[PDB]
Write the structure tokens for this entry.
Amino acid sequence: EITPDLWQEACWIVISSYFDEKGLVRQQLDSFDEFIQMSVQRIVEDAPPIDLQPPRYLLKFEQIYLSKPTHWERDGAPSPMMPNEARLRNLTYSAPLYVDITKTVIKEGEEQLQTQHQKTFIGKIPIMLRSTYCLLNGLTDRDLCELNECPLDPGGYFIINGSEKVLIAQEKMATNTVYVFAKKDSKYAYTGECRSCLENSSRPTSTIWVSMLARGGQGAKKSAIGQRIVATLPYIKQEVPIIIVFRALGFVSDRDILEHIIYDFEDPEMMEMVKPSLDEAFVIQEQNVALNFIGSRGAKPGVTKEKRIKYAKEVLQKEMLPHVGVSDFCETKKAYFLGYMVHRLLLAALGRRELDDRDHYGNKRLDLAGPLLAFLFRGMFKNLLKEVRIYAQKFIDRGKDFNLELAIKTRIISDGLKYSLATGNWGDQKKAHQARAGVSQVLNRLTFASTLSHLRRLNSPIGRDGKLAKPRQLHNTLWGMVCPAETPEGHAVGLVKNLALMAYISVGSQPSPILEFLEEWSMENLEEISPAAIADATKIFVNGCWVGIHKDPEQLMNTLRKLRRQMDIIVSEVSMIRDIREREIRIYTDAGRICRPLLIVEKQKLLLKKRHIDQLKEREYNNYSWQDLVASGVVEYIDTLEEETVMLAMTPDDLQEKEVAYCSTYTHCEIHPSMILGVCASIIPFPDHNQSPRNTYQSAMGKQAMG
Amino acid sequence: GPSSQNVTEYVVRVPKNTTKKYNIMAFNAADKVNFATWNQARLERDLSNKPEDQPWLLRVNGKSGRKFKGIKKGGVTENTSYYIFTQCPDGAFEAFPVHNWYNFTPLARHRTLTAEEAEEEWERRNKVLNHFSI
Amino acid sequence: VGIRFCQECNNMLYPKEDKENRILLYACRNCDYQQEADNSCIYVNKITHEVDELTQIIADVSQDPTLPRTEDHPCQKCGHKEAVFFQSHSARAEDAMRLYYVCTAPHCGHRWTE
Amino acid sequence: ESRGFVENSYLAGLTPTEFFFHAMGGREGLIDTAVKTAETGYIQRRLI
Amino acid sequence: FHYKNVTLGVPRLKELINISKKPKTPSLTVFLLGQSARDAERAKDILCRLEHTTLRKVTANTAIYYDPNPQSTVVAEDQEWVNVYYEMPDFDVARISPWLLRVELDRKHMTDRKLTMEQIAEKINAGFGDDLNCIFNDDNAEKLVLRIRIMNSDENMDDDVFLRCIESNMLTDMTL
Amino acid sequence: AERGELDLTGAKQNTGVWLVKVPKYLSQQWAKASGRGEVGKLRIAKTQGRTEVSFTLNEDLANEHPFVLQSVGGQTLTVFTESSSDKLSLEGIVVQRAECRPAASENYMRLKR
Ligand SMILES: [Zn+2]
Ligand SMILES: [Zn+2]
């Protein structure tokens, strides 16, 4: 039942199962189907109504529809356009967009008159080829050839004015986590950061620092007391001490503040460090005067008092840490997290935990076509509602009536998307100076392996001439997820990169099923549990938010693993990290993390028995494939963060034999170590015999070979 | 004892109406408040907010007595309702809905540091340390 | 060396001096709760920083599948003949190539350097 | 062998872990040349 | 970098091209005139005599105690030497400060620079004023401690925060 | 007799109350309470080393919910009221907290396996 030394033909029969199902450009096709099934319905549904006024009116949007791509002839007779005519006649491949609007008039005229106009035209969205909304979805080769299309064409690009455009995945620093750096040039001796965004609903992302001033400050006013922890909130001009912003949330006492920041009072070394933080916030000792202090320096200095106490209320309520909670209630959570952010800044000053790494590839996320078009659709749906008002008010002051089919300017969404895609600058037409350029370039069709190597390409958005080497050098974390040899020379060395063969980017989900498991395993609520009894507990994070504590981690870990093996409740993409030393547990569900499959290993033997092979070489008339292999708990997707708590073996028959051995607690095993190379670098014979710079040249040279 | 071998069965009712709204009044155990010391109490919505949303102000013993401030919890029936179960003379149980959760905490009626004055004092103290050096 | 909290308003008790009985008194700034000091020392500053990390490493590290193991050095408190060793992995890395061990037997957690 | 010592020859071929470290060395050796040209050209123009 | 630290190549050239105030590693090479250029011991003594050395490099730990009387001796064993000073009691001019500062030294870092707390004792006085007063052990005792009190002429702004300021100021501005 | 005056009777009586967490679907069944408001019957079995409480739905309400007892330690809980006549009253102190759960919530067994 075991697989002894028949391995060289067994590893290439599971890899065949992978590519027969997934393909090579599932990267592009899956983020689009997401943006257009969920990410577009949520944007119009979660939009404020436009109550407006005597009588007053109502308007709210309910449901979105789409139809197959269509072309309107010269005399107004529609017909479905095939992707070929779009190339020949310099057309554009797009689909019309509808919506249901309901309108109720509220004049308390002894009757509430409501009416609705369903399937109202809005605009036209481009369509990525071979998606679930294209005319080529699920066709057979006898029909793909009948429309003059190539059965080998991968898909995953747009047709815009005849051209063929492709979207480049952009890198981005991870959000909703705490990073500790040390700027050795400025006044700060340490710094923390946390970019927050409340679940895909905010155009900006509010960032907050928690600094600490330098030690060698020339001056006896501070020579004795020491460094003071400071904070730089958004939408305010001046720095603020932390005890002040703590009191603005309540918690005026100094026994209650110093239990959110220090979790055990048998530590004199840390309490000494927080003592000179109270001395400067000692005279201002009540809530309302504190709100005035922060409220005095904003985007507008308050002339009166009540406006400042009003102004300081929401900025500390809707711009401070929006990912924890934005409601005006539940402000004990914004206190704990702000405490954990400061408790972690002190640990970096006593030298108990190391600083974070900027280029560690576990702190990065990738923006595919999904999270890129959704960002561009918000700024043009708000812009469409901002100009129904301007047309309603001008038209209702005369008191005549209202008509909405004439209010919707359809050229807003159509020409909005089509513009930025065709030209690249990720902004607006009158905003050809404030946008990020370099996205959406033209597909390369020189040879068939120059096409595939274009639909799989990353890009780090740092400058193209900066001489700093650390964003250009090769990090070891890039093992198995970015090709190590393939990169261009010149001024863009190491700035654009191609991803490896089996690397898979996640698409995203909601964490509610895991929350049901948390109640099922009785994870302790943060608010319910004693603050004093927290040190002997492992803080449980979920997606960046502190959501409780728990005192039985080892049992939980085995339980989480069995849940993953069945995969019944949790999708494979999710990653679950546990660091024994810092005593916490993290869980992620968002989109942008990069994965790759591995082989699960029990005590010292693989879980892939021979029974799985002799029935996997029969997929043609058995309906047993890659999906039935994940759902049986023999392979597993492993993120980059999770890849630091794992012990890998490179090859079964050679590293999992009992002897005087290197290790004995192997947790995973690789499929074949040849899947760490890109697309253009896996056509070289014997690449492990050449000097290294040679393999870089050919991978940038087989892209311009005639065929 | 009966806590070990004790057995019984009682009827439960959930009346669709009540003569008074039911709320929870929570105290920190760490304070170990002697309720017997509460000869009287006053209970009014807090005036800083100048109604149902208003935080409570509890004044024990009428004129001379203790004082607490109660702050409403974020949610109470967001996923699961809370019920008050009471024993009746007929042995049957009666269940009462929890309308709200208010958090009550003790108050320090001592020391009053002033804003502008405090900042001014800090600078002079800061200045004094710098003066007369070496 | 530790810290003192007030018994009325739960704040930080400062040290003060009274010119009557020559005894250290801990006072509060908010309230004026008082009491005397038992150890009669305030400040201490360790510059050698020679803290032995035998007081900072945890016993559950023996569950790590990425650490080397040994059959040579057995545990003393239980006699188990399998340990897992590592380095300081912290600061004070001037001459830091010692080798701390941890027994791997369940519910022993014994730690020792050499 | 665990920190970069490649003990094979180009003829006998390299093992994967050695092929990666070789790639790293080559990459840094490839970046330095890209910087040098611009630097020297500009400084010579100034001096002349 | 393949070659301690020296700057050469084109960055050193444009450090020579301009005369910018900031060389990335300024260094003065020094040569020795007498037999000190021959024997390693005199070379090492002038080495230590040229290098800068502050106080926090020669201290093990410091503690602020509270002796309202010099005979109280809160810590158990320092009573011997402080007492053999006390039978020779001088400088009880105004008061005796109840606040004490106790410093421990590391003879490893002491002897490597050929220092002993006598010269330290005079210069920590001669150089800061006379507001401080230093009594010390004998080096035959293994651990080298010297205790300091403020000059009691000030007691006839809190003295505790002042003593902490002085403690945090002398270990970095020592100039041994 | 004043609006801001709170009755302390319950507290001073040391009156005890029980606190039970109930799922919404059950609570929605309970809004349809049978008769005056009856929803069913509670069953309590205590042994020398095990105590079992459960509730069973009214046959009418149907057209076993075990209880999980939860600690009330660390935080003193009392119940206070507001009448429809806006009079204020303290009914009692909480002597028990609990959370009924549906029996055999699917697989759990599979997860354990
Ligand atoms: Zn106090
Ligand atoms: Zn042992």
Summary: Chains B and D do not touch (no CB pair under 8 Å). The pocket of zinc ion (ligand 1) is lined by residues C 6, 8-9, 11, 28, 30-31, 33 (CB under 6 Å). The longest strand of chain B covers residues 20-28.
